[PDB]
Design a protein around this nucleic acid. Sequence first.
RNA 1: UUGACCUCAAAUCAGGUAGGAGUACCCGCUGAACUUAAGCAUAUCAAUAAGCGGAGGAAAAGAAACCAACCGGGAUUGCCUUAGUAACGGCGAGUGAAGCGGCAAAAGCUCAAAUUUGAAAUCUGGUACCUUCGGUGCCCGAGUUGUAAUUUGGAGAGGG
RNA 2: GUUCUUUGUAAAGUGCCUUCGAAGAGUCGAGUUGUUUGGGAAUGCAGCUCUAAGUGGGUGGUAAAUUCCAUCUAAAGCUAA
Lengths: 148, 203, 193, 99, 51
Amino acid sequence: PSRFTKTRKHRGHVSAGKGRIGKHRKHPGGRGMAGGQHHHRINMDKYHPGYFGKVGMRYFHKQQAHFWKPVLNLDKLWTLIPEDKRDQYLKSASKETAPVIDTLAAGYGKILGKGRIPNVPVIVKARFVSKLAEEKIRAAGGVVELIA
Amino acid sequence: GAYKYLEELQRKKQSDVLRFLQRVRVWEYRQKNVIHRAARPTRPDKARRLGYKAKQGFVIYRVRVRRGNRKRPVPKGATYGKPTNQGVNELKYQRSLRATAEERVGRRAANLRVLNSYWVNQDSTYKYFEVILVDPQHKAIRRDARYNWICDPVHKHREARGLTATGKKSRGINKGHKFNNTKAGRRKTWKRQNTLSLWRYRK
Amino acid sequence: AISKNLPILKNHFRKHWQERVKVHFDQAGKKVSRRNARATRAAKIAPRPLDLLRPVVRAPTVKYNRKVRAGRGFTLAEVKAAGLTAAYARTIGIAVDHRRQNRNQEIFDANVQRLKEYQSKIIVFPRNGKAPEAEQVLSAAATFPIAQPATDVEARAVQDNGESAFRTLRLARSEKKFRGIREKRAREKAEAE
Amino acid sequence: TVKTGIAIGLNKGKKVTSMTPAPKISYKKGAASNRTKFVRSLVREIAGLSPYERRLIDLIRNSGEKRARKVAKKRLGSFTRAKAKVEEMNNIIAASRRH
Amino acid sequence: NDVDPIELVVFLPALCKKMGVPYAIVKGKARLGTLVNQKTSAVAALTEVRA
RNA sequence: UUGACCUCAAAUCAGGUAGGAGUACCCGCUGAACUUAAGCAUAUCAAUAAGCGGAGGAAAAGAAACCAACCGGGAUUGCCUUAGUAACGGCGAGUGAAGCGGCAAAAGCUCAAAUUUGAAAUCUGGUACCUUCGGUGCCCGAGUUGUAAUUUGGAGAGGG
RNA sequence: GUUCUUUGUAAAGUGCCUUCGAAGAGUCGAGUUGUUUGGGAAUGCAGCUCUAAGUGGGUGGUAAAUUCCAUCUAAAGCUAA
Ligand SMILES: [K+]
Ligand SMILES: [K+]
Ligand SMILES: [Mg+2]
Ligand SMILES: [Mg+2]
Ligand SMILES: [Mg+2]
Ligand SMILES: [Mg+2]
Ligand SMILES: [Mg+2]
Ligand SMILES: [Mg+2]
Ligand SMILES: [Mg+2]
Ligand SMILES: [Mg+2]
Ligand SMILES: [Mg+2]
Ligand SMILES: [Mg+2]
Ligand SMILES: [Mg+2]
Ligand SMILES: [Mg+2]
Ligand SMILES: [Mg+2]
Ligand SMILES: [Mg+2]
Ligand SMILES: [Mg+2]
Ligand SMILES: [Mg+2]
Ligand SMILES: [Mg+2]
Ligand SMILES: [Mg+2]
Ligand SMILES: [Mg+2]
Ligand SMILES: [Mg+2]
Ligand SMILES: [Mg+2]
Ligand SMILES: [Mg+2]
């Protein structure tokens, strides 16, 4: 809304808030990223260290789908179970009839081990697992089954 | 048939027989006019492969095209620009000599439609092509459903629009990653990639 | 023009970009037009569901191979195993894809089964009969919806054997990494003069 | 060629029941075709050798197959084409006087 | 003997020699055309001849 | 001497066709510089403006010498994404796609290369008649240096 | 929808057995030059020089030799939304 802008408030003030000495000229410092190495060096180096130069090796024709691997931490590991069934799976923490969790079908590629899970066996089907993720899943009496 | 033998023989162009025939025929073509009607295909198997049929309404024209690069036609080599554009003598005319040949033939026989063309000969100065054209007014062509597609007005001067084989080749019309710049048309792809799409509910 | 602490921007507007600005003002008009075209095409064609039966098919590129989706057309093998010829299937409303091949018996059986279900749920009107007007249903995809196959059960018995799945992944990766080097070492250790 | 069932390693991938689809008639575009063999033999006998093929046969008989293959790679596109051309030229030499 | 694009018949003597079929190079595609009720014929073959 | 054939001509020969306009969009060719880089030459502007040739109601593209590397997808086109990303770049200023995925729309195909060889089965034209976007008969001609039928790789063909 | 037609022992599809299975060349490809592309030991295009093969050929985004594999089938053509 233009009626709320400060240019309505500058009506009647000659310089429109842009100053009498240093006016609003066209491009006093160059256009875009001009002079990032010469007269904007301080502003480049502070607030943008690492901007100039090369830092690694190239990858021609990189496809992100090759690297698609969403990570799910152990601290959730149960939001993948339906809310209704989750209570009766938490109760009756049996080595038999343990709930099977398809993490790939849920949309994850690697299971990480951030949190801690309740001491109830769970059958975790994943493509990849962290070492500590598998250790915690096994300490809870469950197992990790590798899929693809 | 004999067309298989013709096809295999035409691939031995540095054999004694084809070298002799090449020399004799290139001399004859050079003695004839730059563009002139050919009474029959010089390579009937090649014409059949390219869609020619020995019926009324199919026409062969022989055409001679100057070889080499496209010299920039600026006066005295002055380009009046930046040094990256100062080039005059190593510029290559991003369109085939075959395309130039069939365009000149189509301009001569504007009543016909350029169906295809094939190389027949060459010397250092000239490249020689035979252009197969179809008569879209001939009833043998307007009937015969295999060929009356070319009677449609959408096929007017397809050699001048790059819709023949050499035209599509020079336009880069092919499938796959090597032709991302030119798959649906170079300038059409560029327009699509340089269009700013703004919906009513801005995304 | 490098001001205070702000992210570097990459706004690509240095060409004559205003000459190509497509504002989709016609979104609602085009939606009305697409619906009108669907209605007239449905009225034009015989009672016929506005689209061909499509096969079930696995998406490529492991990001998506976990899910199943509609493909272009049924393979020649699938049509033959369903008991039709490709030409007649194309005339009775089945999309046929000569390019696709069957290397997966699950997908093949699923496509043959949905072809059989389609044949048992369509009535083909004879060219010289009566076939009273049969209440065209507009969607074949809604009538034969693609179902994601179920792989496992909700609950099962833990069968841990002590294999350390993480170690299994590490060892598979190491075996791949050294397969060629160990192969060439076993090539050069078979020297035996 | 069976998948191992896991997402890493040599034969990674899901274990699916294989089918071995019927062979396409494409993938046989460069096939044997007794007709082509006859026609090409006749044309090879009526048209002679090309000049570079004559030079290549000379190099095979006088300077060795490595020099011949170098020259054939210079003449034709690639090393595979050079190799095939040199085998064809020495087959010609073997069908020639040194039967 | 006068086929204007001669590649159409240059392999014919060799084809006939390889298949053991007698051949004669004769003057006149016009004459062969008169044989076969055409303007030109460029070839004329006998496969069966009466007793 | 006569009759062809091939090639090439001529006719105010019979019948047709092309040009020019428009040119918003479309298919190509040709092609800058201002500009940005706080200078400037590569770069950028821009594979743009100007110039030239050629279409339609759409054009073009289009049924893979494709994408992929998967448990594989399956003509083309367009939208949302991919993605201001892989990459390019005095690696500076800047530039910058594609595969997958969701959707709109969906549609598939045909020639060449085959001996009809127990039958050029093919076709333009002229003419007479008719039920005239054409049909039949007749007659020239085209065409075997190949016009029909049959096959197009998904196949398919010859035999039982 | 109604009615004269009746196409045609013509045409097409389908199983099994067997022999085959033709598939495009100054083209692909290569070198070099120029242009162009995000395409980077070279993305396309074009000129010149070289110039293929048929269990071949193209592609598989780092040049090369070797060994495999995968995927298509170019150098001819039509097609609505
Ligand atoms: K200021
Ligand atoms: K200039
Ligand atoms: Mg004040
Ligand atoms: Mg002031
Ligand atoms: Mg003629
Ligand atoms: Mg020139
Ligand atoms: Mg007149
Ligand atoms: Mg400006
Ligand atoms: Mg400047
Ligand atoms: Mg300035
Ligand atoms: Mg200046
Ligand atoms: Mg313009
Ligand atoms: Mg118009
Ligand atoms: Mg439209
Ligand atoms: Mg079109
Ligand atoms: Mg195809
Ligand atoms: Mg596609
Ligand atoms: Mg993002
Ligand atoms: Mg650019
Ligand atoms: Mg048939
Ligand atoms: Mg081909
Ligand atoms: Mg240019
Ligand atoms: Mg094609
Ligand atoms: Mg087209």
